[PDB]
Design a protein around this ligand. Structure first.
Ligand SMILES: [Ca+2]
Length: 175
């Protein structure tokens, strides 16, 4: 429903009150953009390089997961910067990953190493603001997001309605 718009200088961050270590994530997000490159969503930790990161890369969705052994990647979809709405879904259960764009093929991967837990303090959109161990800085997002759900939490609406205490943002709500 509720759309959040980003002009390249805008962000929305969920800055969680205590560190999280998750064994599994289910993330879904609708987006629309003209840009071939740009952050969609990333988890960040103040204390490590761990991440579950989605971005546009050459018009594809690129998923990067780093649980402690280093970044591994998976791509799905193409020509997505057509300024039409697209959906992306990620499901991680320990070492197992699935990435699907527009309810097309589920792209699968298996993580290397013994790590199953993702450390994060923040869920970031628009701009990655916690950058210290940030492996590389994605371009800031220029476009629109809708229906961000992260482990059952519809953060655009939760933030819009002040239903949680954790949001920081300067992106623009609309429809
Ligand atoms: Ca970890």
């Amino acid at each position: 429903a509720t759309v959040l718009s980003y002009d390249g200088s805008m962000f929305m961050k969920i800055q969680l009150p205590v560190v999280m270590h998750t064994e599994a994530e289910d993330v879904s997000l609708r987006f629309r953009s003209q840009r071939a490159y740009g952050i969609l969503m990333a988890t960040t930790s103040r204390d490590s390089a761990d991440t579950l990161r989605l971005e546009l890369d050459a018009g594809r969705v690129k998923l990067t997961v780093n649980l402690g052994k280093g970044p591994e990647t998976l791509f799905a979809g193409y020509n997505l910067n057509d300024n039409e709405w697209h959906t992306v879904r990620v499901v991680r259960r320990g070492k197992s990953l699935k990435l699907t764009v527009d309810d097309q093929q589920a792209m699968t991967g298996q993580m290397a190493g013994d790590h199953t837990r993702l450390e994060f303090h923040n869920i970031e959109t628009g701009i990655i603001t916690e950058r210290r161990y940030l492996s590389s800085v994605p371009s800031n997002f220029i476009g629109h997001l809708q229906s961000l759900t992260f482990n059952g939490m519809a953060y655009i609406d939760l933030c819009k309605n002040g239903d949680i205490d954790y949001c920081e943002l300067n992106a623009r709500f609309g429809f």
